[PDB]
Amino acid sequence: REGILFTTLEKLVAWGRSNSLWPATFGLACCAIEMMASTDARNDLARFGSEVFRASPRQADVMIVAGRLSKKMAPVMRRVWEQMPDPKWVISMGACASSGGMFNNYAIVQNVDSVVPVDVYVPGCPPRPEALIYAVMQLQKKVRGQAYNERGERLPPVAAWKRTRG
Amino acid sequence: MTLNVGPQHPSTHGVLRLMVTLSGEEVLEVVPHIGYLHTGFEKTMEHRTYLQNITYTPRMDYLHSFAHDLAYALAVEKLLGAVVPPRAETIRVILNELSRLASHLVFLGTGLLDLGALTPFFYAFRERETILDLFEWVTGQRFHHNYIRIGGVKEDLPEEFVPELKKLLEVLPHRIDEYEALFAESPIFYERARGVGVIPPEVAIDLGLTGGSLRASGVNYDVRKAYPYSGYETYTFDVPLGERGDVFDRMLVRIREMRESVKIIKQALERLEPGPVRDPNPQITPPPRHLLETSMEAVIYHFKHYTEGFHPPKGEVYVPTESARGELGYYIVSDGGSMPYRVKVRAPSFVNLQSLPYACKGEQVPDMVAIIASLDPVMGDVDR
Amino acid sequence: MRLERVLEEARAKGYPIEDNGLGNLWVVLPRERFKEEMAHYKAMGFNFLADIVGLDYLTYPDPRPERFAVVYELVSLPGWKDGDGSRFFVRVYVPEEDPRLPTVTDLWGSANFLEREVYDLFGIVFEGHPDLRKILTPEDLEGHPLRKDYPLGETPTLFREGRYIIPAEFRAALTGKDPGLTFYKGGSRKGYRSLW
Amino acid sequence: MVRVKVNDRIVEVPPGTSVMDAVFHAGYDVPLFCSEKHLSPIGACRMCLVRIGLPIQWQPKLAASCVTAVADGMVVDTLSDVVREAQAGMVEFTLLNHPLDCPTCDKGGACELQDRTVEYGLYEKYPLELPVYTRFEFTRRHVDKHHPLSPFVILDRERCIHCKRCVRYFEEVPGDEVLDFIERGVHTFIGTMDFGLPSGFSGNITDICPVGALLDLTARFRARNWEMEETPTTCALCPV
Amino acid sequence: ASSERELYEAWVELLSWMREYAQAKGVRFEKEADFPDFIYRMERPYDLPTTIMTASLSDGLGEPFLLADVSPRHAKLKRIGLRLPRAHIHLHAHYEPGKGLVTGKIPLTKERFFALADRAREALAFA
Amino acid sequence: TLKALAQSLGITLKYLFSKPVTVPYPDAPVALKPRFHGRHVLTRHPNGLEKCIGCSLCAAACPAYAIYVEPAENDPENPVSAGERYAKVYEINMLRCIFCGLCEEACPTGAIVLGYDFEMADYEYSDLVYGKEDMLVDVVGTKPQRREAKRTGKPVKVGYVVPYVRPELEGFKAPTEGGK
Amino acid sequence: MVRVGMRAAPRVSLEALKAALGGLKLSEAKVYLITDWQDKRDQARYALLLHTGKKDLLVPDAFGPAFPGGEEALSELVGLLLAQGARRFYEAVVSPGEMTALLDLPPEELLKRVMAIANPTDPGIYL
Ligand SMILES: CC(C)(C)c1ccc(CSc2cnn(C(C)(C)C)c(=O)c2Cl)cc1
Ligand code: SF4
Ligand code: SF4
Ligand code: SF4
Ligand code: SF4
Ligand code: SF4
Ligand code: FES
């Protein structure tokens, strides 16, 4: 029941969800290859708990928006995001997803927070694979409830808990 | 069964939608649906100075991008008649063949993983990292590197680039020969690839399937021989070909292309003699960074070039090149302004994809995956 | 070689030949003669159709006959049966209020997708197309992006305290018709070309 | 009306037309410092030089096309190699003593000198031979800097190339002689004993100065010219 | 040769002299212009002791009455020059070793500079 | 060709007993090349004056338009830049920045020059606009790194190592080849 | 295309929008919530452009929490659009200097601009 209502139990389940981040592959653009390189045999996102990679949205919690989110893919991704279990986290990978990138035009959503609740933002073009590990570590200590912004605020464990989805 | 292999699923690389008209386990015909990544490079490029568009060029075909860089550079140069020093051109062809190696590595890793086993994805992709390290040495960027310029290249090579490159040129032939020893005497991959993928050269031509799979159908049609631009006239060159268009001959040709590319790298690097790096014509190349504290004219040209840029003559231009996916070119219309009037890209994977309903027609449902991977599509190229 | 024979065939037919000193050839055909001429062009052995590039000449400083201009690219593969290697372009202007052009689907199937893109990017409808379905832009998108009267749709870049930038009013680089920040543009910035 | 030829083109033109104006009217171009719209032209910057044939009988020396009248059926050559050579030479002479302040110059991209220089300078002298921008390797002219001539106007006497636009204006357009040179030769610099800038039309020279010598003090150090968001409108303070 | 250094060094001294005068007579001294090969040096080295190339002594109205300039790090015929605005008065100072700073052959003493600046204050300044 | 299955087994085992190749970031610092495109830095002269003379060339040549420069006039008594102009406000949106290097290539004073840090992921958009005093060469680390050093009491640890820092990065503090 | 409501009057604009909306079927209509300042929704203001396909409707910058009680009105508004069958919600980001003049442009320019620049939005962010 939501991972709450005991001081030890919420710490425990937050620990589990933090290190057991099961990525949901959503490769969009050239960010995708520097995403996969965070799993190659120089630098693997295969230690923290993300070795296995369930392409299914019904089985993976972290959605890595790796590339430009073109508008014709937005509504589809929409349902794909709703086709995730509720304990889900959404990372915005790359400049084109986090921001509009250099493609300031009619074609691209200029910030993916519009359609999906973003957990962590990561600048870069392409973000070095180790920066992707840094972003998942950021998300790690966020879902543990150990993350603070520049204004001093603690951030909720799971973004996408605060939106009247519909 | 009008089955919807939807966008990005199941793990269909190169976000793409496929409406497989299919009864059973065969493949009647696949109706493709693309457009899921169209960002508008042909449009956004109309609003960036000639110097800036080099930042838009690589990010479209993000695997073999230096073909983009070089084609755009050559088109603009021919438009304004700039001279690339021989050392600059040689470095350009070295980087071209190197990104070709990286591209083919990623292509075969993705293909092998696509159906079958996962393991060999790593080793080949491993080399990519080393290759990327090489690039990170010179361009300071893994990919999307902003190095090339209209006159030539941004700046010089460090002393540290050549040794790492020689080390890789020593390990690569053994590595590629290992993959080929694994592959050529294929136990199942033989019964998986040799028969599949009917590529009648007449149809591959009618649909313009240039992406290296046409020579698997036995058409020796390569720009490196057909239309020498960057000194390929000066290279000892094997142009691999396939007897019958299938997956197996395609893959063998691509591997021999990798080895010959390594040989081209050796050849180019060996002939490397000191010299200049780009066309010093100030309208074409920004002033050298050292005399910014000496001349007014220096400040004027630097300021204007980095704010306005330069204005090439009124005219239209095109230059083709050979990408890891076939014939490429830029139709660039310049109106005498600091920004190009229009930039159209001949996207090789875009025309090459028309051969999917034909190719995967009658093949099996699983083989529809390999027959896509055999084509090596990059949807950043296609949707564009 | 077949390019030279195209030249000796067309020049007698009154078709102007546009050439820049770079080695690229344009042959302008009118609307009607286009279809049968290019049917003969395939019959002449032009297997390979590389490009179909759409052009909006609206914002070009010098005026042109018509707003839209469609250019096909015909080639002959050097390594096939009879390989010359002749590659050249065919330009055909298309009226702004009459975006008609017969398809070359019957000759090449390659123009299946390519022409569609021009119907997506421009208001050009290609007659004789198997299926003119919008390829790239979203289905609910209204209009044709690449024509100059269609906005690029820029969105400002953001900063800390109310400080923003609107790029189209920010760009210092000048297009062809923008005279510049001085009274005018002359000399090199009205066109510059070095002499080898 | 009178017939003129610019390098390949024929133009009908009324008689009182300046050769420079007819050249622009044919669509051609020439550097311009001395002459200005609605200002009395005098060949000073010697930038407008063209070739003139008056029969093919070329003039002995180059005529100042800014202040040279036109005759019926006169040939004008602005593309001769010698013409561009002379124009680049005059541009180099003009750029000789500028203070190297473009990056901190609030006139930024909108400097007529910058654009004419990037247009006509450095003719391709005759390979990938190493080009040199400047030959003058001596000490440049240095005078008083950023002197506010008035609570509205700033004066940087270094950047002045000694055209006549500001003093010619002040004499002709307002009729308030509140600005003129001090010394002569190369030491010439602008000064006044009328400091408040009495004329209520003082600000317009701010726009005319093709260099960043005279600037708008109230807009000093806010943004570069191309960075500003331009909206043309009409001033409704008074009924004109 | 290397005398350049002491020249620039002596140049600093000249500026020092200038400042003293300004502080005595209660007149505004203003740093007019710095070294370009020091502003526009990005990674390049800079060996000069100061960054300032041109300065002046300005009256209350801002019009200078005494102007001083020194040749840059990279220019030929390095010198120091002096000027009186409105007075067609120009001086060419060098630095000769052992003797000192020279106007031609006449050494440039601090009190000479003070007398010139005082004459300027009385004569040229409007207020 | 049944032998190939056995050969595949053999090569996979050979690579099995070949244990090493990987680097465990963040436990092992990534070796970055000296030319890498990283977090911008604003550099200072030896004199202590800041190098930025606020000329808006980095903002004009920025193809992504992420650079905004509000200028101001040096105060002669306590100058900040070397000329008569300095950058009162220099903010860069790392989410817009595409990491070209044109800002460095246009900077005539070498003030704005790309650095090396890549550990810049943060949670909120409006917090990813790095400010001048968040990129000056004086500082040691990225924004989330500094914030963690405050909320943690643990000093900043950079997760990268480079053979050396370029001359254009004079002052740039980094681990250098192991001399320390 | 109609224009109903006024600036900075969430309740008046909302009630006029209820009345003028009626039983309009929005199965293929498009809703553009134009705003400024992409990120900071905490103080955001919102205008609405409703393109039904057969006729269009404009409401100026009168919605959003930037106005007192504007979020409650915006909540009712999005709930209303969702009730009538809307599926496609869009947000366009324009400069504050644009938003005000934009409502004075001809219908074709305003509508073309907005439909061109739109960003697909999750309506949940405004509930
Ligand atoms: C399991 C891994 C993480 C390796 C995995 C993750 C995601 C995908 C599907 S995204 C994708 C993948 N490759 N390509 C190329 C450029 C190679 C054609 C794409 O264009 C796209 Cl869009 C596949 C595998
Ligand atoms: S941020 Fe760069 S690497 Fe990532 S999708 Fe955009 S262009 Fe590609
Ligand atoms: S101050 Fe300007 S307008 Fe006046 S003479 Fe000098 S350059 Fe001409
Ligand atoms: S007046 Fe012109 S040439 Fe002089 S510093 Fe300013 S912009 Fe540069
Ligand atoms: S590297 Fe970043 S700040 Fe520099 S020009 Fe490119 S986008 Fe702009
Ligand atoms: S280019 Fe350099 S000196 Fe100019 S504003 Fe940018 S950081 Fe400052
Ligand atoms: S233009 Fe000044 S001399 Fe004629």
Automatic annotation (TrEMBL), chain G:
Upper classification of the organism: Bacteria, Thermotogati, Deinococcota, Deinococci, Thermales
Name the record gives this protein: Uncharacterized protein
Pfam families found in the cross-reference section: DUF3197 (PF11432)
Family matches, as InterPro entries: DUF3197, TTHA1528-like_sf
